[PDB]
């Protein structure tokens, strides 16, 4: 029996879309600290970790702690119906429904039957990540879209003070180098030579929904999963975990 009030519903709908393009259902671990999400793709190739501290909400009213079970598709269509500045509200009382209130010029109320979600909890804390880089959003977004031309597996190469991406197919070749000197490369933390490869499809699901004013974190080691991260209103950030190939 809670209520929640979040402003800028279009943003929240965007991020919920982001989580949506990989999994179809998911549960929301609502605690008085904040709203939490954590789930994995069907393929067991990517891990979506959503963290929402209550501070971000214009109002945050939780009485206890409970897990919501919702159809990410239905919620995605619903939240997608919100716009730029209309206010989002999330209410839940006794009954087994979630009430979404979009109030901008007017109030609109939706109800979503909650669905049971068999939870498979796999918490994966910090791991041996050789290199760690921060980079503007549109840099990586452009890059992935480029590797979409020539292949389906994008290879990452992290060298001392230099970050380079690449991909090769039958004939064509794609390369994207950039270093700290370059503008888009905000930071590089080189411990040593790192190299990996990742499913360009999964990356495309990842980086869609990124403007130029989007900073992204990338930790990873030689032939091991990437962990990507980026903040949301500077408090609650999302983190993906992508297993490499080969």
């Amino acid at each position: 029996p809670f209520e929640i009030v979040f402003e800028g519903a279009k943003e929240f709908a965007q991020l919920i879309e982001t989580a949506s393009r990989l999994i179809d259902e998911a549960a929301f671990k609502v605690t008085e600290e904040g709203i939490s999400m954590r789930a994995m793709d069907p393929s067991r190739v990517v891990l979506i970790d959503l963290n929402l501290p209550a501070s971000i909400f214009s109002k945050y009213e939780v009485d206890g702690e409970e897990t919501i079970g919702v159809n990410m598709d239905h919620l995605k269509k619903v939240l997608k119906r919100g716009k730029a500045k209309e206010t989002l509200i999330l209410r839940k009382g006794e009954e087994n429904f979630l009430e979404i209130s979009l109030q901008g010029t007017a109030t609109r109320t939706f109800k979503l039957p909650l669905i049971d979600v068999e939870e498979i909890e796999v918490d994966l804390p910090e791991l041996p990540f050789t290199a760690k880089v921060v980079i503007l959003g549109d840099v990586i977004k452009e890059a992935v879209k480029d590797a979409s031309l020539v292949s389906d597996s994008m290879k990452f190469i992290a060298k001392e003070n230099e970050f380079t991406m690449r991909a090769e197919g039958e004939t064509q070749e794609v390369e994207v180098k950039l270093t700290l000197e370059d503008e888009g490369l905000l930071d590089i933390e080189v411990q040593e030579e790192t190299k990996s490869a990742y499913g360009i499809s999964y990356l495309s699901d990842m980086v869609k929904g990124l403007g130029k004013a989007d900073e992204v974190t990338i930790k990873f080691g030689n032939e091991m999963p990437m962990q990507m991260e980026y903040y949301i209103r500077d408090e609650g950030r999302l983190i993906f975990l992508l297993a490499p190939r080969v």
Binding site: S43, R44, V45, L47, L124, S153, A243, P244, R245, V246
Partner: peptide, 11 residues
């Protein structure tokens, strides 16, 4: 070929 490894093995 076998390319994409998976992180949670053997459910």
């Amino acid at each position: 070929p076998e390319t994409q490894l998976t992180l949670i093995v053997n459910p």
